[PDB]
Design a binder for this molecule. Structure first.
Ligand SMILES: NC(=[NH2+])NCCC[C@H](N)C(=O)O
Ligand SMILES: [Mg+2]
Ligand SMILES: [Mg+2]
Ligand SMILES: [Mg+2]
Ligand SMILES: [Mg+2]
Ligand SMILES: [Mg+2]
Ligand SMILES: [Mg+2]
Ligand SMILES: [Mg+2]
Ligand SMILES: [Mg+2]
Ligand SMILES: [Mg+2]
Ligand SMILES: [Mg+2]
Ligand SMILES: [Mg+2]
Ligand SMILES: [Mg+2]
Ligand SMILES: [Mg+2]
Ligand SMILES: [Mg+2]
Ligand SMILES: [Mg+2]
Ligand SMILES: [Mg+2]
Ligand SMILES: [Mg+2]
Ligand SMILES: [Mg+2]
Ligand SMILES: [Mg+2]
Ligand SMILES: [Mg+2]
Ligand SMILES: [Mg+2]
Ligand SMILES: [Mg+2]
Ligand SMILES: [Mg+2]
Ligand SMILES: [Mg+2]
Ligand SMILES: [Mg+2]
Ligand SMILES: [Mg+2]
Ligand SMILES: [Mg+2]
Ligand SMILES: [Mg+2]
Ligand SMILES: [Mg+2]
Ligand SMILES: [Mg+2]
Ligand SMILES: [Mg+2]
Ligand SMILES: [Mg+2]
Ligand SMILES: [Mg+2]
Ligand SMILES: [Mg+2]
Ligand SMILES: [Mg+2]
Ligand SMILES: [Mg+2]
Ligand SMILES: [Mg+2]
Ligand SMILES: [Mg+2]
Ligand SMILES: [Mg+2]
Ligand SMILES: [Mg+2]
Ligand SMILES: [Mg+2]
Ligand SMILES: [Mg+2]
Ligand SMILES: [Mg+2]
Ligand SMILES: [Mg+2]
Ligand SMILES: [Mg+2]
Ligand SMILES: [Mg+2]
Ligand SMILES: [Mg+2]
Ligand SMILES: [Mg+2]
Ligand SMILES: [Mg+2]
Ligand SMILES: [Mg+2]
Ligand SMILES: [Mg+2]
Ligand SMILES: [Mg+2]
Ligand SMILES: [Mg+2]
Ligand SMILES: [Mg+2]
Ligand SMILES: [Mg+2]
Ligand SMILES: [Mg+2]
Ligand SMILES: [Mg+2]
Ligand SMILES: [Mg+2]
Ligand SMILES: [Mg+2]
Ligand SMILES: [Mg+2]
Ligand SMILES: [Mg+2]
Ligand SMILES: [Mg+2]
Ligand SMILES: [Mg+2]
Ligand SMILES: [Mg+2]
Ligand SMILES: [Mg+2]
Ligand SMILES: [Mg+2]
Ligand SMILES: [Mg+2]
Ligand SMILES: [Mg+2]
Ligand SMILES: [Mg+2]
Ligand SMILES: [Mg+2]
Ligand SMILES: [Mg+2]
Ligand SMILES: [Mg+2]
Ligand SMILES: [Mg+2]
Ligand SMILES: [Mg+2]
Ligand SMILES: [Mg+2]
Ligand SMILES: [Mg+2]
Ligand SMILES: [Mg+2]
Ligand SMILES: [Mg+2]
Ligand SMILES: [Mg+2]
Ligand SMILES: [Mg+2]
Ligand SMILES: [Mg+2]
Ligand SMILES: [Mg+2]
Ligand SMILES: [Mg+2]
Ligand SMILES: [Mg+2]
Ligand SMILES: [Mg+2]
Ligand SMILES: [Mg+2]
Ligand SMILES: [Mg+2]
Ligand SMILES: [Mg+2]
Ligand SMILES: [Mg+2]
Ligand SMILES: [Mg+2]
Ligand SMILES: [Mg+2]
Ligand SMILES: [Mg+2]
Ligand SMILES: [Mg+2]
Ligand SMILES: [Mg+2]
Ligand SMILES: [Mg+2]
Ligand SMILES: [Mg+2]
Ligand SMILES: [Mg+2]
Ligand SMILES: [Mg+2]
Ligand SMILES: [Mg+2]
Ligand SMILES: [Mg+2]
Ligand SMILES: [Mg+2]
Ligand SMILES: [Mg+2]
Ligand SMILES: [Mg+2]
Ligand SMILES: [Mg+2]
Ligand SMILES: [Mg+2]
Ligand SMILES: [Mg+2]
Ligand SMILES: [Mg+2]
Ligand SMILES: [Mg+2]
Ligand SMILES: [Mg+2]
Ligand SMILES: [Mg+2]
Ligand SMILES: [Mg+2]
Ligand SMILES: [Mg+2]
Ligand SMILES: [Mg+2]
Ligand SMILES: [Mg+2]
Ligand SMILES: [Mg+2]
Ligand SMILES: [Mg+2]
Ligand SMILES: [Mg+2]
Ligand SMILES: [Mg+2]
Ligand SMILES: [Mg+2]
Ligand SMILES: [Mg+2]
Ligand SMILES: [Mg+2]
Ligand SMILES: [Mg+2]
Ligand SMILES: [Mg+2]
Ligand SMILES: [Mg+2]
Ligand SMILES: [Mg+2]
Ligand SMILES: [Mg+2]
Ligand SMILES: [Mg+2]
Ligand SMILES: [Mg+2]
Ligand SMILES: [Mg+2]
Ligand SMILES: [Mg+2]
Ligand SMILES: [Mg+2]
Ligand SMILES: [Mg+2]
Ligand SMILES: [Mg+2]
Ligand SMILES: [Mg+2]
Ligand SMILES: [Mg+2]
Ligand SMILES: [Mg+2]
Ligand SMILES: [Mg+2]
Ligand SMILES: [Mg+2]
Ligand SMILES: [Mg+2]
Ligand SMILES: [Mg+2]
Ligand SMILES: [Mg+2]
Ligand SMILES: [Mg+2]
Ligand SMILES: [Mg+2]
Ligand SMILES: [Mg+2]
Ligand SMILES: [Mg+2]
Ligand SMILES: [Mg+2]
Ligand SMILES: [Mg+2]
Ligand SMILES: [Zn+2]
Lengths: 116, 101, 140, 59, 151, 112
RNA sequence: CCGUGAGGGAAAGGUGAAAAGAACCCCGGGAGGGGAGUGAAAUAGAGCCUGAAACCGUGGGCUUACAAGCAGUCACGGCCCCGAGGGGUUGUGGCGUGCCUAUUGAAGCAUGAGCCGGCGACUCACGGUCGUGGGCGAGCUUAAGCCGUUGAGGCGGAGG
RNA sequence: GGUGGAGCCUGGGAGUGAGGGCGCGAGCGAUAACGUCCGCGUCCGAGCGCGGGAACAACCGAGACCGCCAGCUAAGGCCCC
RNA sequence: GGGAUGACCCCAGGCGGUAGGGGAGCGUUCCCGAUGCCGAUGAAGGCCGACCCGCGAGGGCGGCUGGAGGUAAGGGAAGUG
């Protein structure tokens, strides 16, 4: 019994083109070029979702060092105090106290200058 | 009055009336749990070292589910090695009832 | 919980005298201000930094034989168009550009940092026409 | 000569962009003062054979 | 295939691919690679494996009680309707597919058109037809030869 | 309301007539006629004829006023191709595509 | 149709249940269309069943004329849509060297591919050798054939 | 001592039989070569996935199942990019 | 380890990877299942889907087109991607 391609090939090419919607030129209109693109973005994502956690921390850190320096010290000198002080609040939160609740943070700064 | 609790290996700022997705909890829905605390502030400021003895955050388990599907794809060139995976992240949606400290 | 994103903020204007100050070690503070990395609300993809009004830029100081041996250069696109310009003469010609060119290179590349240099305004002499801004002078 | 030939197909955008100058500037028309029919200035009106206020053509 | 064999165009310098006869399966309308041919799917299953599966088959229906025998068929003589009246009185309502297994021709001729009856000379009783069905009927005759085949 | 004409299988290259149609789109019927009439090209004979054939359909079949008529939508689609050969030098034959056009024109009533 | 000749060798199917295949009127030389009319359906109108993809065009929303680039991915923000959420879009900041092939090694200035759709490459028969699910087991098994059936199976011990 | 994707034995299926950089020991070479030919090892090959090295298969770090807007570290780094 | 056996639960550890070995599955054509079931209150196919289940290949649901065919649990055979 014969069994030609039939309905199978097309459909799969419509899987790849639906995920390729929004791509420039053929990349969204040509199948082959849609795969070659979906390949990269496939690795770019997981290569980048692994990075989001590093793009922020560095940010967060960048904001804390700014505040810390408003009180007469630097990000380096108060990470230690919070260590020595036994404080485990994280840079994400620390980065939000530094902006919205600037007088809580000031405390932490103080509890850091002393823990040393 | 606001609190920095720690659940799911991660720390969150919570307040009464806050729906929060956190890592799944072994907790029957509708039930209520207590969350460790690291810092209370707003009115009276208090800092944990690392936590605070009696203070705890009471939350209501609204339910459990599964976050949207992320497409984790692997691909090595000139080798014929692709991989495709569907990943939905378990998760718990809480309601922040009160801040008992 | 998500990270904080600051709505449009009215920038602040700073006034920095450079007389006596050392070149490269001044432009590092400016660019920082421009970047805004002195703000607790710093954000990478916006111009949330001061404007920097530098003055007496003709009196910047420098270490060693740089006036004689620091060679600002240009390439006129055509052959033989490599212009080699000593520091001594850039001052005795277009001094406000010794500092500019210095800070310019301390600002990121691409659009953003290209419109942050715009927020830099370095004038030679003790005066600036930005009086209408009431610049908050800084000491560094 | 060595038969120059394109190295790459020209994208849609790249051709359609090059055609930002293929717009037809519509013809300059004005009214004829004796029949009011539109026609190009400086020509003997094809609608009433008038030009310069006098007759010149059968139409 | 029914084409020639001339090398369609030279091996080199035509600027196009390499080809020979347009009967190659790489062509359209050309040859087919490993497509089917006549075959003898038949094959020689072991006897005991069939003389045994011919007794396992029945027994199964016997466990269910779906097996039924009869001395003779009272009053059938070659008319289907002469059968349902019988089958009715034998509890064969039609709600169950049946395998009628007898030598009596007239009988096999009466019910063979029946949408829920499989007829067979007991000399042809086979598993598939047994399993095909929900019940199973036989003459003690057809029953007898049956015995004398699994024995 | 709307009224349209469609000159199909027009043997003309679309990418040529559209230069004409692009020149009257959104114009008043009288202004198109005045344009299609002194537009020095070949697709004007066709774009015009379609304009008139559509103006008729509006006035005569859809109860529309030849005085409110502007060109609401006009748009030249392409049809089949007349593939004719062209013997070049040295035994090689090309294939020219004599192009056929689909010239549709939709009119409306700019009330007021 | 190609070849002087032997010889080579295509492409091309489908309206609808029934032509009831569009009278008549209108723009046009015509082609073609616009109403009328037929039909359950007319983007089933004969260039006709379904009508995908490349390819082309019209309208709309976002966006772009100091920018740089395997064109995408992550975060944020602005506008549009849908009714603590989602969809489309892209301004800025971060990151980022196509697919396949052959290679010690390619984004690779090494090969192949303009694009799309369909054909397109590890099979079959006999014999062999391991493994495996079963049947019988110092025993197992039949081959061509004969009968039966008309998708009924049984016989056949020669022989291996 | 060692319970490890350790080892012994029988049997089925392979692919490989064009390697390359580095380090140390030699020969050949000119105490040349991103040279060549052997030996122990390592890595790339197959890790052209990640960090450092401005950028770079093989130098330093480190063996990527998946997700997080959490924490600690290695090489390398902390005036600005 | 439970419990008894693949019922699901707990603890621990493994899971970069070309040539290549192995295992478990999806999907296409066809046969029994089928004198059956689905179908004009609309088959197969086609265009959308931000919803559902699946690691994934894929499977359902809904809306538009489409207008007469399609075919389940469980198995069999290939011109099977
Ligand atoms: N009387 C018989 N042996 N009948 C056997 C079946 C014959 C035929 N195949 C049928 O179904 O009618
Ligand atoms: Mg095929
Ligand atoms: Mg297909
Ligand atoms: Mg395919
Ligand atoms: Mg598919
Ligand atoms: Mg994919
Ligand atoms: Mg990454
Ligand atoms: Mg990390
Ligand atoms: Mg950043
Ligand atoms: Mg300091
Ligand atoms: Mg800490
Ligand atoms: Mg605020
Ligand atoms: Mg690559
Ligand atoms: Mg490749
Ligand atoms: Mg490959
Ligand atoms: Mg690959
Ligand atoms: Mg979870
Ligand atoms: Mg400062
Ligand atoms: Mg800094
Ligand atoms: Mg700034
Ligand atoms: Mg100095
Ligand atoms: Mg000057
Ligand atoms: Mg020449
Ligand atoms: Mg010549
Ligand atoms: Mg070229
Ligand atoms: Mg385009
Ligand atoms: Mg376009
Ligand atoms: Mg161009
Ligand atoms: Mg007249
Ligand atoms: Mg032949
Ligand atoms: Mg022939
Ligand atoms: Mg040729
Ligand atoms: Mg041949
Ligand atoms: Mg041929
Ligand atoms: Mg052949
Ligand atoms: Mg054939
Ligand atoms: Mg043929
Ligand atoms: Mg052919
Ligand atoms: Mg074939
Ligand atoms: Mg073959
Ligand atoms: Mg072949
Ligand atoms: Mg045969
Ligand atoms: Mg076989
Ligand atoms: Mg046989
Ligand atoms: Mg039956
Ligand atoms: Mg029957
Ligand atoms: Mg003109
Ligand atoms: Mg008229
Ligand atoms: Mg010529
Ligand atoms: Mg010729
Ligand atoms: Mg000739
Ligand atoms: Mg062509
Ligand atoms: Mg000849
Ligand atoms: Mg002839
Ligand atoms: Mg010939
Ligand atoms: Mg013919
Ligand atoms: Mg018909
Ligand atoms: Mg007529
Ligand atoms: Mg006429
Ligand atoms: Mg007429
Ligand atoms: Mg006609
Ligand atoms: Mg008509
Ligand atoms: Mg009707
Ligand atoms: Mg109907
Ligand atoms: Mg319908
Ligand atoms: Mg249709
Ligand atoms: Mg139709
Ligand atoms: Mg039909
Ligand atoms: Mg059609
Ligand atoms: Mg069509
Ligand atoms: Mg447009
Ligand atoms: Mg500029
Ligand atoms: Mg601009
Ligand atoms: Mg960010
Ligand atoms: Mg709501
Ligand atoms: Mg960068
Ligand atoms: Mg980007
Ligand atoms: Mg890299
Ligand atoms: Mg590279
Ligand atoms: Mg090669
Ligand atoms: Mg080679
Ligand atoms: Mg390149
Ligand atoms: Mg190139
Ligand atoms: Mg080669
Ligand atoms: Mg290739
Ligand atoms: Mg070609
Ligand atoms: Mg194809
Ligand atoms: Mg093959
Ligand atoms: Mg084989
Ligand atoms: Mg074969
Ligand atoms: Mg075989
Ligand atoms: Mg064998
Ligand atoms: Mg046996
Ligand atoms: Mg025997
Ligand atoms: Mg073991
Ligand atoms: Mg091993
Ligand atoms: Mg081993
Ligand atoms: Mg072996
Ligand atoms: Mg050899
Ligand atoms: Mg070699
Ligand atoms: Mg080889
Ligand atoms: Mg060798
Ligand atoms: Mg060697
Ligand atoms: Mg070598
Ligand atoms: Mg190297
Ligand atoms: Mg070495
Ligand atoms: Mg050493
Ligand atoms: Mg040494
Ligand atoms: Mg040595
Ligand atoms: Mg030696
Ligand atoms: Mg050497
Ligand atoms: Mg060599
Ligand atoms: Mg060698
Ligand atoms: Mg490689
Ligand atoms: Mg190799
Ligand atoms: Mg490595
Ligand atoms: Mg390794
Ligand atoms: Mg590496
Ligand atoms: Mg890589
Ligand atoms: Mg690469
Ligand atoms: Mg690296
Ligand atoms: Mg690097
Ligand atoms: Mg770097
Ligand atoms: Mg290790
Ligand atoms: Mg630390
Ligand atoms: Mg450095
Ligand atoms: Mg820079
Ligand atoms: Mg693995
Ligand atoms: Mg591992
Ligand atoms: Mg391993
Ligand atoms: Mg392999
Ligand atoms: Mg296994
Ligand atoms: Mg297998
Ligand atoms: Mg299957
Ligand atoms: Mg398939
Ligand atoms: Mg049937
Ligand atoms: Mg059927
Ligand atoms: Mg109906
Ligand atoms: Mg319907
Ligand atoms: Mg089918
Ligand atoms: Mg199906
Ligand atoms: Mg459907
Ligand atoms: Mg039928
Ligand atoms: Mg079936
Ligand atoms: Mg099944
Ligand atoms: Mg079966
Ligand atoms: Mg085939
Ligand atoms: Mg095949
Ligand atoms: Zn006149």
């Amino acid at each position: 019994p014969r069994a030609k391609t039939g309905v199978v090939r097309r459909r799969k090419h419509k899987k790849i083109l639906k995920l390729a919607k929004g791509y420039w030129g053929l990349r969204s209109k040509s199948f082959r070029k849609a795969r070659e693109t979906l390949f990269a973005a496939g690795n770019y994502a997981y290569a980048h979702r692994k990075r989001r956690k590093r793009d922020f921390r560095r940010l967060w850190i960048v904001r804390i060092n700014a505040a810390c320096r408003q009180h007469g010290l630097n990000y380096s000198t108060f990470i230690h105090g919070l260590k020595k002080a036994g404080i485990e609040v994280d840079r994400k939160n620390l980065a939000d106290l530094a902006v919205r609740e600037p007088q809580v943070f000031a405390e932490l700064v103080e509890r850091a200058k002393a823990a040393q | 009055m606001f609190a920095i609790v720690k659940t799911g290996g991660k720390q969150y700022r919570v307040e009464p009336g806050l729906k929060l997705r956190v890592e799944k909890l072994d907790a029957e829905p509708g039930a209520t749990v207590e969350l460790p605390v690291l810092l209370l502030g707003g009115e009276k400021t208090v800092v944990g070292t690392p936590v605070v003895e009696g203070a705890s955050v009471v939350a209501e388990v609204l339910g459990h589910g599964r976050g949207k599907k992320i497409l984790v794809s692997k691909f090595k060139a000139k080798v014929q090695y692709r991989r495709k995976k569907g990943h939905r992240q378990p998760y718990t949606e809480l309601l922040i009832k009160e801040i008992r400290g | 919980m998500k990270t904080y994103v600051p709505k449009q903020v009215e920038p602040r204007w700073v006034l920095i005298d450079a007389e006596g100050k050392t070149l490269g070690r001044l432009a590092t503070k400016i660019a920082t201000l421009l970047r805004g990395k002195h703000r607790p609300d710093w954000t990478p993809n916006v111009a949330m930094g001061d404007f920097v009004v530098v003055v007496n830029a003709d009196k910047i100081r420098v270490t060693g034989k740089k006036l004689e041996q620091k060679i600002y250069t240009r390439y006129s696109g055509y052959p033989g168009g490599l212009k080699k310009i000593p520091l001594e003469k850039m001052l005795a010609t277009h001094p406000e550009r010794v500092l500019e060119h210095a800070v310019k290179g301390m600002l990121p590349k691409g659009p953003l940092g290209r419109r942050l240099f715009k927020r830099l305004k370095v004038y030679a002499g003790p005066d600036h026409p930005h009086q209408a801004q009431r610049p908050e002078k800084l000491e560094v | 000569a060595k038969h120059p030939v394109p190295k790459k197909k020209t994208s849609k955008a790249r051709r359609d962009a090059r055609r930002s100058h293929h717009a037809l500037t519509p013809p300059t028309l004005v009214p004829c003062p004796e029949c009011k029919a539109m026609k190009p200035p400086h020509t003997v009106c094809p609608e009433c054979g008038y030009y310069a206020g006098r007759k010149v053509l059968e139409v | 295939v029914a084409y020639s064999g001339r090398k369609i165009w030279p091996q080199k310098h035509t600027g196009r691919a390499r080809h020979g006869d347009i009967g190659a399966p790489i062509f359209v309308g050309g040859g087919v690679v490993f497509g089917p041919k006549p075959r003898d799917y038949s094959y020689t299953l072991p006897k005991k494996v069939r003389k045994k599966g011919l007794a396992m088959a029945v027994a199964d229906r016997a466990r269910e009680g779906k097996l039924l025998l009869v001395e003779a068929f009272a009053g059938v003589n070659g008319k289907t309707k002469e059968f349902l009246a019988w089958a009715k009185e034998a509890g064969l309502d039609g709600s169950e597919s049946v395998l009628l297994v007898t030598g009596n021709e007239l009988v096999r001729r009466a019910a063979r058109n029946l949408p829920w009856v499989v007829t067979l000379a007991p000399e042809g009783l086979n598993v598939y037809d047994i399993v095909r069905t929900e019940r199973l009927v036989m003459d003690l005759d057809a029953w007898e030869v049956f015995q004398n085949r699994i024995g | 309301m709307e009224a349209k004409a469609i000159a199909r299988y027009v043997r003309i290259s679309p990418r040529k007539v559209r230069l004409v149609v692009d020149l009257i789109r959104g114009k008043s019927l009288e202004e198109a006629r005045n344009i299609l009439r002194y537009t020095n090209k070949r697709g004007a004979y066709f774009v015009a004829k379609v304009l008139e054939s559509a103006a008729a359909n509006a006035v005569n079949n859809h109860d529309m006023l030849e005085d409110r008529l502007y060109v609401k939508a006009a748009y030249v689609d392409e049809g089949p191709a007349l593939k004719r050969v062209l013997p070049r030098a040295r035994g090689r034959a090309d294939i020219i595509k004599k192009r056929t056009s689909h010239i549709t024109v939709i009119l409306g009533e700019k009330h007021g």
